[PDB]
């Protein structure tokens, strides 16, 4: 054994990650007021003399407002019918738009149903990427990036994962209510009788203190994918990052002397996403937003 006479772990913007390698860190913050989305993206170029390919670790963060709304339904005969529009699923995806780039890793890589999601992408010099479905107490990497998000009552699925694109869906699953657990497909999910016959639209639905954050507020994504570039090919590549929602409609009609009658319009508005196009310049190690927003 020779663990005692090993080299030092640390023998010695842009971060030096070891001999002949550095990470050039770029960021883009693109928001849409109309979409209620903020894409806060980190783009880390792995510049390594011992890795025959250029690599870009893309960490997708930011915010997707739930856009949950509670409204009157206009029209005679609908005075006692109210509508709640809410996100059944949050969509996060990255699609490559040029043949000279491919995706070589994705986090989360598998479906995850825990309330807390915390994972790590590690990089070791010479092109070695590794992933762990946990944070802390992992191996020894030259560089690492983590993802962290909470999805109470929702589950994360890999909807699509290939050399050109990755799509995750953070989908409604099971909710705690004062009347017991309810499935995301229960048509009575979130409805309630208002306090009186003149009760506002908001009163026909579960109060804020009963709605989990992905329904009441929104989602704070935290996802990773690494783009691989075959050297010799074009210095530039384009790709799109999409953040959005699939919305359901819940209708609640009050029959004052009887109670509530509920209806669900499932998948009422699908793939309602904010798409941003970016261009990687592998030569200058730069990112620019195409068209912007
Ligand atoms: N915007 C679209 O065309 C996509 N979707 C829209 C939606 O269902 O909300 C329908 C489809 O094309 O199947």
Residue numbers in the entry: 12 to 23, 31 to 311
Structure paper excerpt:
Staphylococcus aureus (SA) leukocidin ED (LukED) belongs to a family of bicomponent pore forming toxins that play important roles in SA immune evasion and nutrient acquisition. LukED targets specific G protein-coupled chemokine receptors to lyse human erythrocytes (red blood cells) and leukocytes (white blood cells). Each leukotoxin is made up of two subunits of approximately 30 kDa: a host cell targeting S-component (HlgA, HlgC, LukE, lukS-PV, and LukA/G), and a polymerization F- component (HlgB, LukD, lukF-PV, and LukB/H), which can bind the plasma membrane through highly conserved phosphocholine binding sites. Each toxin is composed of two domains: a central β sandwich called the CAP domain and involved in inter-protomer interactions, and a RIM domain which contains several divergent loops driving host cell specificity.
